[PDB]
Design a protein around this ligand. Structure first.
Ligand SMILES: [Cl-]
Ligand SMILES: [Cl-]
Ligand SMILES: [Cl-]
Length: 161
């Protein structure tokens, strides 16, 4: 039943390291949905957690790591199966760990929030290949660069079909 959502910002197929903890650029007409996301558990890899520097507040943070935990404010898991088990009866879990975390969750995922950013350089990891027949682009919205948008981008919600 659980919504399992990959959230990522992309430069072509390269994952962008976003300054914001949540890697999205939400269009103005979806800003309302940010309020809905605030209680959802987040799952991320260790390197992503270290880049943020602290947990996202007001929600369960689950960090996947093969090393001892370094922050009692988050829940430490050794596998994606353990991470999902910790998420309990949450209606939606958001997965944002690096390319490897995305690849490991892809088969269980059933939603993606993808921010396709133009004129930005990606990082050193690639978003996993996913099968086009398996995923539907249910929502998409482009915005050009302007005085309030440093980069043009397209925000897309995919759902499994
Ligand atoms: Cl919700
Ligand atoms: Cl909820
Ligand atoms: Cl911006």
């Amino acid at each position: 039943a659980m919504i399992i959502s990959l959230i990522a910002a992309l430069a072509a197929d390269r994952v962008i390291g976003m300054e914001n903890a949540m890697p999205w650029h939400l269009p103005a007409d979806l800003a309302w949905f940010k309020r809905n996301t605030l209680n959802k558990p987040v799952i991320m890899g260790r390197k992503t957690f270290e880049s943020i520097g602290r947990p996202l507040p007001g929600r369960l943070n689950i960090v996947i790591s093969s090393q001892p935990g370094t922050d009692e404010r988050v829940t430490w898991a050794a596998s994606i199966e353990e991470a999902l088990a910790f998420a309990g009866n949450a209606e939606e879990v958001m997965v944002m760990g690096g390319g490897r975390v995305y690849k490991q969750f892809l088969d269980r995922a059933n939603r993606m929030y993808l921010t396709h950013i133009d004129a930005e350089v990606g990082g050193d990891t690639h978003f996993p290949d996913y099968e086009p027949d398996e995923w539907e682009s249910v929502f998409s919205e482009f915005h050009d660069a302007d005085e309030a948008n440093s980069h043009s981008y397209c925000f897309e919600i995919l759902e499994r079909r």
